[PDB]
């Protein structure tokens, strides 16, 4: 799976630098150059979404009480509802990735940096398996970068 490999690695990095509060400087293997500009446009957009929807995310967090890895893997059931309605857009996508990033921060405060791996795997599954032909149509992460680019 070419897109899942590209996606998972771009998602993981953003999750893990939000939980850290410090960026990873080593180079991307799979996504190559297309991931560099994606994470530099994920950091920018997802920090906007996380401030817009702190309240919303905090609310979903207190309801969906997260403690362990199986809580992290069963987030798939509610996370699909960002598309269970018909609408597919990059705003729904960065909201998916921004919430996962917000949860990765929460996981750190409860000392669960092990559970950031199957959160990243949970998010990419909901996103790649379900909305692939939308993603490929919309130029994948090349489009992700292009769509949110502002100048």
């Amino acid at each position, epitope marked *: 799976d070419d897109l899942y490999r590209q996606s998972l690695e771009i998602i993981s990095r953003y999750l893990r630098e939000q939980a850290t509060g410090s960026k990873d400087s080593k180079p991307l293997g799979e996504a*190559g*150059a297309a991931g560099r*500009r994606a994470l530099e446009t994920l950091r920018r957009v997802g920090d906007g979404v996380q401030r817009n929807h702190e309240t919303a995310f905090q609310g979903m967090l207190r309801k969906l009480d997260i403690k362990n890895e199986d809580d992290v893997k069963s987030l798939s059931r509610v996370m699909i509802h960002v598309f269970s309605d018909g609408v597919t857009n990059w705003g729904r996508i960065v909201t998916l990735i921004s919430f996962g990033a917000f949860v990765a921060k929460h996981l750190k405060t409860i000392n669960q940096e092990s559970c950031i791996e199957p959160l990243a795997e949970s998010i990419t599954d909901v996103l790649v398996r379900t909305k692939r032909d939308w993603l490929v149509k919309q*130029r*994948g*992460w*090349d*489009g992700f970068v*292009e769509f949110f*680019h502002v100048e």
Partner: antibody
Amino acid sequence: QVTLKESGGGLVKPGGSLRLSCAASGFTFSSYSMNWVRQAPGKGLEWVSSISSSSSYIYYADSVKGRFTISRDNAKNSLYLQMNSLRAEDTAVYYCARQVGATWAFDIWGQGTLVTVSA
Amino acid sequence: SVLTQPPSASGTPGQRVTISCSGSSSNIGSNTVNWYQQLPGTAPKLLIYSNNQRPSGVPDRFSGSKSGTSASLAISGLQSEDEADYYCAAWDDSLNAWVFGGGTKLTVLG
């Protein structure tokens, strides 16, 4: 100032090869899809090839498909098009056009570079 | 041409003008219609985007419409400097490729 400048076009024989060369200026070339649009003098515009920001999504028109290769070098702000085994019918002005990611509109264009396939 | 335009439309000054762009489920039916103006000598310059959104420097007298799998451009308020070829374009999901209309050479004759 936001400009596209196409170079390289000129006289090529039927069978010959030509590399059209677009230079992007005053924007972040590394964040746009690029497009080659060609226009036979007198006739309407034909799209010919597109290439996403980091060269991962490449698209060709049927006519040029096989004979033309699109590429870009985001270090040199340069888009390319290797026109191979050109036939008389490829005599066109080859424009270059930037793509708005949010609408896929070809917003900035270039002046165009005339290609002339003849003996 | 896959998108089909009239070869030549016209009107006298002041009038409404309509240039249609007959599409298809996989081009105009799925994606948007973008209009470009080509004056006498010039290169094309984005005239209308996402069906009916004008950029900076395109006046209120240029309107856009998408009607299922077709698309009118409306040049509501004709002027002798709208002598141009108007080209619609839509991305085609079936072709995985852009496709422009034949071109409509507008003219003023009053």
